[PDB]
Amino acid sequence: PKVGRLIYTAGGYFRQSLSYLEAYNPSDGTWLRLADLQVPRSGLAGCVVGGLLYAVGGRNNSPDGNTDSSALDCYNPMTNQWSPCAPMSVPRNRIGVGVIDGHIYAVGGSHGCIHHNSVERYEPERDEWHLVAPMLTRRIGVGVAVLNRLLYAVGGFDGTNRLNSAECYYPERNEWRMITAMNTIRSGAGVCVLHNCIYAAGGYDGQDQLNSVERYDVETETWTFVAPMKHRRSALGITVHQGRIYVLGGYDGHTFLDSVECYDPDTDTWSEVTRMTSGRSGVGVAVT
Numbered sequence: 001p002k003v004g005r006l007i008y009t010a011g012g013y014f015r016q017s018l019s020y021l022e023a024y025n026p027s028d029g030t031w032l033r034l035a036d037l038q039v040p041r042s043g044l045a046g047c048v049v050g051g052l053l054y055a056v057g058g059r060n061n062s063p064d065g066n067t068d069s070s071a072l073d074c075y076n077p078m079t080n081q082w083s084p085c086a087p088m089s090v091p092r093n094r095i096g097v098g099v100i101d102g103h104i105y106a107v108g109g110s111h112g113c114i115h116h117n118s119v120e121r122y123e124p125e126r127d128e129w130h131l132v133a134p135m136l137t138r139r140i141g142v143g144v145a146v147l148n149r150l151l152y153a154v155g156g157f158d159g160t161n162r163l164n165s166a167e168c169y170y171p172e173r174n175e176w177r178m179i180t181a182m183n184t185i186r187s188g189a190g191v192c193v194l195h196n197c198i199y200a201a202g203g204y205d206g207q208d209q210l211n212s213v214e215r216y217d218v219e220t221e222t223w224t225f226v227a228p229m230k231h232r233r234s235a236l237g238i239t240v241h242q243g244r245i246y247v248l249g250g251y252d253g254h255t256f257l258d259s260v261e262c263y264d265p266d267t268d269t270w271s272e273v274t275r276m277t278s279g280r281s282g283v284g285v286a287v288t
């Protein structure tokens with residue numbers, strides 16, 4: 001049943017790091033501007049736990065300077081208010097985030113010229129962060145998705161090279177293990193889960209922005225190309241709403257897109273369903 005869930009987009013980058021928090025309703029195609037982040041942020045990740053939206057890491061860059069963010073903030077849709085939470089052990093720009101058992105996992109990202117392979121876990125009910133096992137690879141601009149309590153970190157940049165590799169995190173054993181490498185090198189790709197596959201849409205391969213999209217079926221352990229998006233894009237927002245994948249904005253190598261595309265896995269098609277109120281990349285996106 002359709003209960004009215006919305007797609008939230010937080011922060012992002014256009015001309016500088018943005019504060020913006022907006023919600024889109026796929027049912028009527030309307031947008032609603034909500035309370036601003038207390039601190040502008042691009043390259044952050046967004047996620048939802050217990051009906052609350054969380055903005056994680058990222059960075060604030062403008063003429064007033066460049067500062068990587070270790071912050072965690074919690075937005076309550078019911079009160080339309082942001083609340084500061086406990087910060088991570090380190091600033092994490094171009095971070096990847098995933099949720100398991102109501103816990104927020106902050107993966108990789110960077111702080112200055114430091115490229116994190118480290119990972120830490122946040123427990124809402126205790127407002128406390130905890131270091132877990134580090135990834136086998138240093139990854140900033142990594143994409144993250146979770147399927148059946150297993151977390152996947154896809155692609156990114158290790159400081160020297162851009163990766164087509166990916167790895168899986170086993171939360172209860174607290175380990176990481178490499179999985180099949182993608183067909184394409186991708187950093188800043190949109191990564192999400194839909195049914196039994198992890199999608200890796202767009203990204204930057206080191207020379208061009210990508211509009212190609214491939215998915216990893218956890219059952220067959222293979223990476224498969226599906227239909228390409230209309231726009232190439234890296235640093236795109238991505239989420240799933242009522243069985244379909246939605247990609248928001250990103251950079252196509254020329255413009256900061258306002259375009260929103262929707263992927264229908266049954267017909268293996270993407271189509272443009274709306275536009276953001278303004279183009280932007282590096283947003284955090286989540287559904288509730």
Ligand SMILES: O=C(O)COc1cccc(CNC(=O)Nc2nnc(-c3ccco3)o2)c1
Binds near residue numbers: 094142157
């Ligand atoms: O590193 C990559 O290959 C892809 O770049 C990514 C990856 C993941 C998220 C993002 C979000 N983009 C982003 O934060 N862009 C941005 N942030 N600060 C700036 C900026 C530009 C000039 C001064 O500051 O541009 C980019």
